Amino acid sequence: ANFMIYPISKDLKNGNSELVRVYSKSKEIQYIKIYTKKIINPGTTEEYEVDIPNWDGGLVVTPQKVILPAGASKSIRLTQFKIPKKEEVYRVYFEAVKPDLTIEISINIIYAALIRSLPSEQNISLNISRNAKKNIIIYNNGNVRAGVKDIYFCKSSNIDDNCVKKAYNKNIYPEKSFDTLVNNNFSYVFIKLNHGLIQLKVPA
Amino acid sequence: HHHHDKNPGSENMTNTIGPHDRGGSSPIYNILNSYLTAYNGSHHLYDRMSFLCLSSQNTLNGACPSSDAPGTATIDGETNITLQFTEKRSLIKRELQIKGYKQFLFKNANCPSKLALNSSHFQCNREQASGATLSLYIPAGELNKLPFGGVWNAVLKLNVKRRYDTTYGTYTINITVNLTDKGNIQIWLPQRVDLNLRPTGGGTYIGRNSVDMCFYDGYSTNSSSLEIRFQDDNSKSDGKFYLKKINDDSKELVYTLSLLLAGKNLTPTNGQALNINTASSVPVLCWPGRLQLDAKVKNPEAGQYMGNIKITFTPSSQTL
Ligand code: NI
Ligand code: NI
Ligand code: NI
C-alpha cells in the first residue's frame, strides 16, 4: 500500500456529483485503477456485489484509471446517472497496478468507498408483520434505509418500564425485512434511529 | 431598535463550535454575533469603543493590532486575528484566522457600518454614539486548515478600551472546536515479506514472519464499524490461502494469517470479511496492528514460491 483515499463514504443526491481524492504518500509514482460494484441485498446475510459498467450502471465514475504522481492527489468524480426511486448503494474500489527454496508473499491494500445513491424526496416507512414463528418482522417501506438502534417492545400504548428493550444497531434497507426474533405477543413498538416512532404490532 | 444600558468591563466566556466535519468545507462559525459591549442613554463615553489584542505578533492569545488606529478616518472592514489552536489530547498547535469587527450604536440614527476593531470612531448624522457591538467569527474553510480531527482549543484576549483613553477590561473567550473527520480511514505498513523457512524434526518445516502496520479511522466520531477482507488470488473456495510454485501451478503449499489489531486477535479464512467496531487531508497517528504469516510444511520441493494477498478496506452495510 502506497496510497489512501478521501473519502471513504459519500451520498450522492439530486443528480449532483462529488469527488473522492486519492493521495500518494509514496515517493515513487504509481497507477491506480478504479472500478465499481453494485451491492445486492445490502444489510442482509445474502448480501453480494456485482460489477457494473461505468456508464450504464447507476453511477458514473470518471476516471477509470489514473497516474498518481508522488505526494500529489488526483480527483475522481462520482455523479448519479439517474436518480433512483429507492436508495442504491455501491462500492468503488481503488486498486493499484504494479506490474512492470524461497517464499515471497506480496501484500496489497485496496480501498472501497461506500456510496449511497439517494432518491429525490426522502421518506421512511416501517411496516410490521408477524412471522410464522410469530416473530415480529419489520419491512422497510421507506425508500431510504432505516438504521434502527434499539427497539422498545411494549405491552400497551405506553412504554412505562415493563417493556423489553433490545439494542440492534443494524440498518434496514428498502424492500427488506428484518426479524427481531421475538415471538411473544406484545402490542406495540418504539424505535430510535441514528441521525420515538410508535406503531401497532400485527398479531397474525 | 431598543437597547439596555451597560458598562464595559472584563468578561470571561466559553464558546463551543460545531461538531463540524472536516470533509465538508467549513462554513462561517460565530464566536460573537454583535455582542453588546457597552451602551448608555445619557452619556457618550461609549462613543469610541476600541478592541485591542495583547500582542501584535504573539499568536497565543490572538495576534492583532495592540494599539489604537492612528488616522482620523475610520477603517471599514474586519480585523484579522491569528490565533493559536491546541488539540487537547496531543497538544499539537495550529494557528487559524479569526475575523472581528465592531459596530456603533446611536440613539436617534441607524448607521451600521462594520469597522475594524481598533478603528476610529465616527458620528452618524452629527450624532455621537452611545454604545458598540462586537462580532467575531471563524471564516469559511478555516476548520479545514486543521491537520486532523480532535478537540482544538484556544483562548482569545481583547482589551476593551475607550479610544485614546481608559481601558475597561479584558475579554477572555474560550473557544472549543470539535472537529470530526468522519470519512477519514488509513492503513500503512510502515516498512513484500519472506517466511523465513527452516526445517524441523521429521522432514517438517516451519516458517513465521509478521508485518507491523499503521491503522487509523476518523475520530471524535460516534462508534463506527468497518469491513476487511483477505484474499488470495489462488483462492479455491476452501478458505485457505495458497502458494503455488512459480512456474508450477501444479504444486501448492498452504499458509495462514493472523492479525492482532490494536489489542484484538483474529485469523481470517480466504475470502472472509471481518467487521471491526472502532470501540475495540488525513492523520499520521495510528493504533498499532500486526499481520502475522505462518506455515507448516512437510516434504516440500525446492524452488521459490510466491503469494499475493489483497486486503480490502471498506465500511460495511450492516452499520449505522
Ligand atoms: Ni486532479
Ligand atoms: Ni486619516
Ligand atoms: Ni500496544
Side-chain angles (χ1 to χ4, degrees), chain B residues 58-86:
Chain B
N58 203 13
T59 62
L60 226 71
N61 272 317
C64 69
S66 46
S67 59
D68 272 339
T72 30
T74 70
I75 300 173
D76 289 34
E78 260 145 82
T79 307
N80 271 307
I81 310 178
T82 322
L83 177 63
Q84 215 184 45
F85 282 79
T86 331

Side-chain angles (χ1 to χ4, degrees), chain A residues 10-199:
Chain A
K10 212 34 163 167
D11 312 2
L12 303 182
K13 59 168 217 178
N14 296 146
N16 286 337
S17 63
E18 318 288 289
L19 303 155
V20 183
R21 284 160 205 83
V22 187
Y23 301 92
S24 192
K25 292 246 82 185
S26 160
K27 179 175 170 177
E28 140 226 289
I29 178 187
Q30 26 178 4
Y31 302 78
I32 315 293
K33 73 188 290 191
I34 308 99
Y35 54 107
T36 322
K37 292 175 180 246
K38 187 174 186 176
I39 295 175
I40 320 298
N41 301 319
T44 61
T45 56
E46 316 129 53
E47 177 198 301
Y48 73 107
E49 303 176 13
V50 71
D51 297 295
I52 60 133
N54 310 324
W55 231 286
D56 318 19
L59 210 67
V60 183
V61 179
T62 279
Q64 139 233 228
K65 197 162 174 217
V66 274
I67 316 268
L68 194 50
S73 86
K74 279 289 177 109
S75 292
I76 276 69
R77 171 150 268 143
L78 272 35
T79 156
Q80 23 182 191
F81 201 14
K82 342 183 172 104
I83 301 187
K85 275 185 158 183
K86 286 166 187 167
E87 160 178 21
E88 272 171 334
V89 70
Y90 303 85
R91 249 144 201 171
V92 192
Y93 300 75
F94 293 83
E95 185 171 3
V97 212
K98 28 197 177 66
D100 294 295
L101 164 149
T102 16
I103 292 182
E104 267 271 337
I105 302 184
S106 15
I107 285 301
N108 250 236
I109 293 298
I110 304 180
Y111 290 104
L114 188 59
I115 313 300
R116 304 173 69 196
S117 190
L118 292 188
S120 277
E121 283 103 32
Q122 286 172 46
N123 133 40
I124 278 169
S125 181
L126 292 173
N127 290 15
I128 289 46
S129 23
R130 259 166 153 161
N131 205 353
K133 309 194 76 180
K134 318 281 176 168
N135 22 220
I136 292 170
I137 310 281
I138 330 289
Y139 173 84
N140 192 179
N141 180 0
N143 60 0
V144 150
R145 67 167 197 200
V148 209
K149 307 227 55 157
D150 333 54
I151 311 180
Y152 292 100
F153 293 61
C154 300
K155 27 216 292 161
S156 274
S157 173
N158 49 299
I159 33 46
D160 234 311
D161 282 295
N162 276 283
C163 311
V164 180
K165 171 197 181 182
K166 205 131 201 304
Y168 287 91
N169 302 304
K170 199 274 217 176
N171 277 312
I172 310 180
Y173 282 80
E175 302 172 333
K176 308 266 113 65
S177 348
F178 150 116
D179 180 0
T180 83
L181 321 1
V182 175
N183 54 336
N184 313 85
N185 49 17
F186 315 71
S187 59
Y188 293 39
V189 171
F190 287 70
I191 303 184
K192 214 193 280 172
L193 275 20
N194 73 29
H195 318 262
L197 326 317
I198 171 188
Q199 42 196 328

Side-chain angles (χ1 to χ4, degrees), chain A residues 1-9 23 25 39 42-45 47 49 91 93 95 98 101-114 145 147-149 169-171 173 194, chain B residues 22-23 181-189 192-195 197 227 229 243 255 282 291 293 300-320:
Chain A
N2 300 0
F3 66 99
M4 64 133 91
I5 66 167
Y6 211 45
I8 217 87
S9 47
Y23 301 92
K25 292 246 82 185
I39 295 175
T44 61
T45 56
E47 177 198 301
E49 303 176 13
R91 249 144 201 171
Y93 300 75
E95 185 171 3
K98 28 197 177 66
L101 164 149
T102 16
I103 292 182
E104 267 271 337
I105 302 184
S106 15
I107 285 301
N108 250 236
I109 293 298
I110 304 180
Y111 290 104
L114 188 59
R145 67 167 197 200
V148 209
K149 307 227 55 157
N169 302 304
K170 199 274 217 176
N171 277 312
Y173 282 80
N194 73 29
Chain B
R22 300 181 60 270
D181 209 5
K182 287 149 51 187
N184 203 333
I185 287 164
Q186 327 182 211
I187 295 301
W188 300 111
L189 296 150
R192 333 167 51 177
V193 300
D194 209 301
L195 290 179
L197 199 71
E227 182 157 296
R229 298 91 93 104
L243 307 166
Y255 64 104
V282 296
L291 186 75
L293 309 189
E301 156 170 1
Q304 85 256 129
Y305 284 48
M306 279 180 186
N308 185 20
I309 283 211
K310 302 297 181 56
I311 304 157
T312 351
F313 274 85
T314 335
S316 49
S317 343
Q318 295 90 310
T319 60
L320 300 57

Side-chain angles (χ1 to χ4, degrees), chain B residues 24 32 41 59 70-71 98 111 126 133 137 148 176 185 209 219 227 243 248 259 263 271-272 301 304 315:
Chain B
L32 284 182
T59 62
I98 303 300
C111 190
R126 311 181 169 280
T133 101
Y137 66 93
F148 57 92
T176 318
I185 287 164
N209 202 335
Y219 255 143
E227 182 157 296
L243 307 166
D248 184 348
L259 180 112
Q272 198 187 353
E301 156 170 1
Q304 85 256 129

